[model samples]
Target: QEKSDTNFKEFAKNMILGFLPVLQWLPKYDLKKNILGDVMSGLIVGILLVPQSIAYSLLAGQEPVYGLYTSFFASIIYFLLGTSRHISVGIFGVLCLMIGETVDRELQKAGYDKSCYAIMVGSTVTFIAGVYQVAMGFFQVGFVSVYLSDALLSGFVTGASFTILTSQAKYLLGLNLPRTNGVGSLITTWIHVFRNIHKTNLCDLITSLLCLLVLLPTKELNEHFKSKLKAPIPIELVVVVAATLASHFGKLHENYNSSIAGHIPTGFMPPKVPEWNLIPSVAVDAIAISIIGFAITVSLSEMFAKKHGYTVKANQEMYAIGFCNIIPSFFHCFTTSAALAKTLVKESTGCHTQLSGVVTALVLLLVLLVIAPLFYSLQKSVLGVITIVNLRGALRKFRDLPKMWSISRMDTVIWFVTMLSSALLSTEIGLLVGVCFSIFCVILRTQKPKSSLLGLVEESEVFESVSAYKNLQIKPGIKIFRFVAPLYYINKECFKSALYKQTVNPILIKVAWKKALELHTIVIDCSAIQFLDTAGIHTLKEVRRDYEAIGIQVLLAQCNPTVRDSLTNGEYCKKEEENLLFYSVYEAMAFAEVS
Candidate 1:
């Protein structure tokens, strides 16, 4: 009983601190247990983050360290406001893609200082994105994200992953090629490298290749050897150690004259004041970034949060991110989002609360204070190697293409076309094309929502939409049809065509069979329709008036109260209020025609 009370207090403190954390948790922060785990996780993530942020920034047409600076403060701010125990908000590949296309010099032809302009632009865009998300959450607009289907997200991510991998390959090869947009940049860079292969130094090439060879397989081998050796060291740590030692001993820098990182700044000092002009340039990109970032964050956070027996409100998360980015933007940092790699690190290390994130921030501060000098000897080629290694996961998703293809040929086509567009066209247009295709798919599916004559399952008394089990008495004067999905403009024509074809064909077929049949009524099942738009209401009114003119009655049944009200308000049911509405499909059938 005592332990339960203590646990509750601790949990409450953790959650509250996550929202408005200050210096309260600092004294209790232990270095040996809780802090140690966070440090280990944070160190690994920080190392990974430095290279990744820089590479992503370069992809966005800025210097690599811009990525690092963005990451540094984003982490600290998110540690304070982010709600989840395992969420790691920072620079990500998709965000970089949006930034690249939106701020492209070719597109804008602006002559501004590249670094300053990009930083200012990115910061403002991120700020706006954070505000947009928070506003949505405040207004309870969380359902907006649900409109994006799994197929669409999968297709987009697959395309995005491919673009990141191909775009970074130039850095991996240590090629001195100009950064252009899309696959053209990749192909052009490779051509430049091949044409000047004679200029490539043996030491730089050997060292870069060695890093890849060693790091790639170390992860799997370490896992396999773990049981044999208790607390087996990770392969990544070993690679880092080995490379550092080799560079120190072999004097490789003298032989190769290779570019190195020089030095990383020490300490997490606040950044310069924000420049005002950048906000406008980044406005369009900000909206795209927010949508993409939020989708990724909510999906992953919910996945892990559920496994640990907790729930996270999507809107509250928006609030957390809004504040996270807002604080960091003042410090000249760019935007941030939930990163999968860092989140996995925290979860794997048995972190029980958002305190892990707070500890990570402190650990970063310590690194900035003490270890900045140690990175002076780090090679740019090594950073490139790290970037290449990070991108491997994105490249291997090609195996899923066949499975995606088997699901729907249209989806497969959309996936391939979107990827091509990402590579061939601007990233913005490519993404827009993908989104349009997905929306078109939704409209097409709903245009002719599956409707069938409902029947009853024997002994169960449950209604089922099926034609096979339907009673075949064929009432001489009534036709029944079920409409699924909300009635809307996109599918208005589909409804009209299906209803007209069914009424004319079935009635004609019956008349031909008996040569003495009369069609006098049409009954519609509106149980599945949750809402109706203006166009839908107009179409409904037209159909009802036309049917009545042909000497047939039109009746609707099983409409939800709200839908019924919409129909009445739209005037479709105003004149026929006495005979048109019924509580059940059977009631409408009986009222319409007696067989």
Candidate 2:
């Protein structure tokens, strides 16, 4: 009773503290050491999130105001339960557009197209996505994040930032483009803008160029002189404020008829239900967004943790991110993801802890209640300028030229294709391209895997490549073959034929006797097989069953524990007796069979 009760309390406490990281760390908070950085980062991220939330929501086809509180609400939830100390959660480009796609589809699928239920569909989908991520806790597998490579993510950020620059282009030129996004949507969007170009507002274009003149040029001085600089200079805020003040006081709108942000509504949303019936229709879409959302968060979190030196468990991040969306979703917010744009701004601006979220939440709240309307006089072109300029930070990644080539041609191509894919398409499409290309790179890498015949070198106990080592003892008719690489669906056949051609093909026997070396027993050194998929297992079984009584016998040596369990649990061919599976190739050689 005592042991059971103790474990009961132990698990209960673990779950409680784990879910409430803020509760655990509240007392441990260091005022002097931590507060200043959090304060600074909180202000910067909170202030910046206003326009971004608006930007992303516009992309998602929601009223831009719907995104405002996504920044605030997600920040607080993540601040409390999130594993990451640095990331700022809010509207993301990829997920936002996906949500819009879902919204458009679901709304139409329900047999109507009305603006009324846009958030109804969006927030509901967010709930479904949230449930999917929290379900990640139920499954509790940590291996799902392995497929994404750094080059892929680098390409995503670069491409996504580039997309935003392109996305903001029409606004920069004072051209209005209605929502139209998909593969190659950027191309069509630019064409439409070009087709309507003579009508472009010079006032908007001039202001955007002038704003970029200030924001873009000083960005370099900030990066180059970062060590000498106490804070980022000519910061986006300065330009935003100056532009707003100038636009208001100078009568630029009246004299030049410039387009501006105009009348942003302020305040909180009425709480509501996480829709139930809608889930049935968009269940699969939710999962897509869910995993993609989880992927983006975990990927970014891992990158930040590795760079800053810390450990973050994946499960807690899921919970934090899930609740971040799940709760806000009820209050008319769509799904939120961590954005590198705002996150790096916080990092470089001296953020230390999630208390920064508290600050951002408060600042965004202030924007909602009071300051949102103040930006009404600010030119829309200036907002576009701010959006484009922020993206320039991650754009530097593309310039890492010869370094990537000398280090990894594969990874360079991955980045190249991803960058090109992103430039040619949208972020989601780019991710699809990046993921497909990444898998091919790995498969082609496996296709390039090496295999060799093994031998026990004279006076050496260890086996080595038979051809590479001199004076190797072959022990009469025994042949040992070794393969390096996982046997998966892609390369399983290549391995099968390689083994067959060398060992049992009988064609090899004619040449073998010609060379004075004939075969009887075949030893497969599986110590380096690394991983075995079902298809790979099937190949081995076929080799055994086809050749069992057909003159040659097949045996396996040194199978790793994972492959062993895979064989056991996955119903691998059980024709092998205890004698058929050998712990050592030496043991296999000792029991060497006669033809």
Candidate 3:
């Protein structure tokens, strides 16, 4: 069976390689089932890719067609190398905006040749990002992505989506606003729109608003209409095409004097290689964009994969997407990620594996090469409609804010702060604040774990909070206390309080300092303590001395191996041979003489 399974795996690999003769997979494949499913998914995604690609290109500081080129190549490469059954790789909204901002800033600063240098930098970053992803997968670092809490991810995605929408508003308004990052884009766009109110084309406004009306409802209607139809129709694509035709034939933009996407070049040029010259200025931006881009990709892929009851391997995805971008770099395309709309289309079409991505790429290529002339009439406003309407799913999630605040006010505050900060700083800095704040919050929670004196229940085999149980009459000569958290600088005072509570008798204040015998012994049940540090040990030493000075003996019992080792390393234990550490609390009580 093992041999057969291995042979099958080899055969499947070969089949996926299209019989490159170097790879192999099982001898048999359900060609009809897989191909039909893949073809249907691909055809639907092709429609989505055409409009989205152009809009994303504008977002990325390039002509709309660049988006098409990226989606075409990324899907092809990922299809070949990917391991998942349903993960789709293509142009993502956030990645598009990130790359656009990075390339534009670096180009203006370095005074490099815009066309060649920007393309080169974009491709290089994409390739390197892929390399890092593959390495992470090789070392099984995929879990790192998941380690980020769900709340943090939700807040980050919400913030990122808002940025994308805000940044895309210039194109929507037909104004040439200066390139500002996401947060400031809203204010900058409004200002630009207000200052240049005359420049806003009434025709473009009407076209865009009409497109939004159709596209937004069409999306929900498509989902609802799914119940009445045998096969799902691509409503978003229909809406886009309809709007383009309306604007072109009705001369809507001509009347309003609004700008329209003049033309998309016929097909794509040959693959272009990334240049090393643009590295210095673009490197930091590239790295930042890559981190954010890849994080978003992994998240989107995993989300849809689970919705369809399929498991996505994070490391494999990293390697697959990394190489997906790397190979495409040689072909003149910039970086890419799993396009949310296309992935959704694939899911809606019941695609079972990433073979659908391959099919989608092929269709997109066909459309780009053969049907390129058809997009000549596509209005920029129509593209805006597609971009803005695609974001409706996110914008409606305002309810999440209140829910987040109610769940954790501190985290909600941090979320808002990080969002605001990201706008003021660069996207990278904003993300850094968010991640760091999350970790800081965790540290704070653990640093202040509950600590209190523990009391024994009389004749009962249980311990309870000292103040709450009030059942055990503490032995007059002995003090008993426990700490819930590891002894550290943060809780040193709490440790002191617990000690003082048990050892000192408030009623016996009249006892002489030197002859005071209010308490004679102390026992710390170290069962709750998992570990200790140098400061924690020092605090314990001080506590022991204070008790001893007052004629109280100090003892430790039920210390875990780790805590015992910490105490043993210090002078807390003098005679190891005598075994001061007991295995159980009851055993310690049996051996100790309180009086």
Candidate 4:
């Protein structure tokens, strides 16, 4: 009873710690040695996140202030629940673009500019996604991400990046183009851009070019000197501020038709529930968002965890991201995920703990409470430029096409199909198509798995594929066949037919008969067979019966323990005739020779 009580106490302690990750770290936080590092990193991330949050929010079709709200609440919540020391959870382009698409569609369906429509759609999508993630965590379905291949993901992101770029083109060129949906959206977007060429605002276009010029070079310089530099230059913040100053002083908004993110409210909005009615309409999108968000978060978390000598829990990460989205929805925030840029900033600046997120959250909170209105004059063109520049990473996925092609033609095909589908259709539909194609490829490969004829290498017990090793010798009246796939209902017929073709060849049978070496024994190399179903077992039983009826012996060699047990349990070999299985091909051959 005393031991039981101690066990219960320990379990309870661990349960509490599991829910509250900060509790595990805060008590042992190094104030003397780590405080400075956390503060500096936090400040740097805070500065960078400000402009980025705004840009991502605009990308998500929300007012800029909500982006700051997302930043503050997401960072704070993740700091409490997240296990990663450096990952900065905030508004990311991919998630925002998904949310933005949903928001536009729903608002268009409703037909009127309802005051809270954007927040309603954004929050509802976020809440639905969050619930899904949390449920996935509880169920430990983190391995579901394995279905999304790296090739597919890379292609999908590359396609989504192009979509994002096309969507932001209007802002860069200062045109008010209507959003298009479905296949050919990319072509449609470009067509709209060219048609509206005369209406493009020269001021916004020039400002966007200038911002890009500064951002591109600075980013390159930062990358070149990443090892030597403590942190990258805050070029994003610099451009935002400079653009805001220019827009304000030059009266560009009035004189040159420059679009600006206007009237950002200071302070947080009262917490409210998301529009429940919107859930059903955006449910599919919410699921896509959840999966995509989880994929990005866990991947980046694992990467940094390895670099920093720690391990990240995928289920726990799901829980953290779920709460990060669900809790922040009440404060009128959009869907959030792990942004690589902010994470890189944190790592480069030497962030030591989740405390950096806390510090960054505090900075965002201060901005919310005090200087929110100061960013009202920041031009949409500058935000557009920021959005384009940050997408440098996603756009870089294009390079993978040729690389993947050289490595694997099938992977290149998957990549191309995924990218093309995503570019042509919606992101969600594109992902669905890609996933389906990938799964199809897997099944197709399994259905026609490679089989080989085995022959013994001279002076050895080893057996290898005859086609692969020209020096391999085949014993008289003995044929060794290797099947290199698990037996399943879908491919059992293929397996049976292939085996029959090899054994029942008229030419080989005639040659053997004329040489007085007619086939006597057939050894099946089952070393590669990992699994067998009822159909597979039945098929093998049939093969054995057929061969025995013809007065030829059939034997299984190197049957793994599981397959052997399965065969036994399935009653394939019973009573007196249990010598059909052998430990190796050579053992079976020896037994056959003796017989």
By TM-score, is 2 or 3 better?
3
Instruction: Please report, as a residue range, the 10-residue window in candidate 2 with the lowest summed lDDT.
Output: 1-10
* Candidate 1 local lDDT, 313-406, one digit each (tens): 6656777677766777776566678877667655665464565554555555555567665656556666666656765544556678756676
Best by lDDT: 4
User: Of models 1 and 3, which has the larger TM-score?
Assistant: 3
lDDT per residue (tens digit) for residues 245-312 in model 4: 87788787677777877687756656898888777777888788888888888888888888878777
What local lDDT score does residue 495 receive in model 4, on the 0 to 100 scale?
92
Candidate 3 lDDT over 256-365, as tens digits, reads 66666646678667766667665455556656655656677777767666675756555456766677767777776777766655666667775755666666777777
Task: Estimate, for each residue in 1-595, the C-alpha lDDT of model 2 and write its tens digit.
Answer: 0111111123299888887887877888878878887797777676666666766766566555777777778877777788777787766776765676678666666754354488788888888788877777668875666677767877876776666666677778876676556677778778878877788887987787787788776887776787777665547677777888888888887888777664666667468896687778778777667777777888888889878887888778878887876778778888888877678778987787778888888887767787766777777677666666766556677578437699888888888789888777766678889989899877788886777788786775689986566777676657788989898788887887888766667445546657873566788899999888889888877777765544667789888877877876776465345457767777677677433
Q: Give per-candidate clash totals.
A: 1, 0, 21, 0
Could you tell me the C-alpha RMSD of candidate 3 in Å? 8.0
Each model's lDDT: 0.65, 0.74, 0.66, 0.81
Task: Indicate the residue-level lDDT of 172 in model 2.
Answer: 82
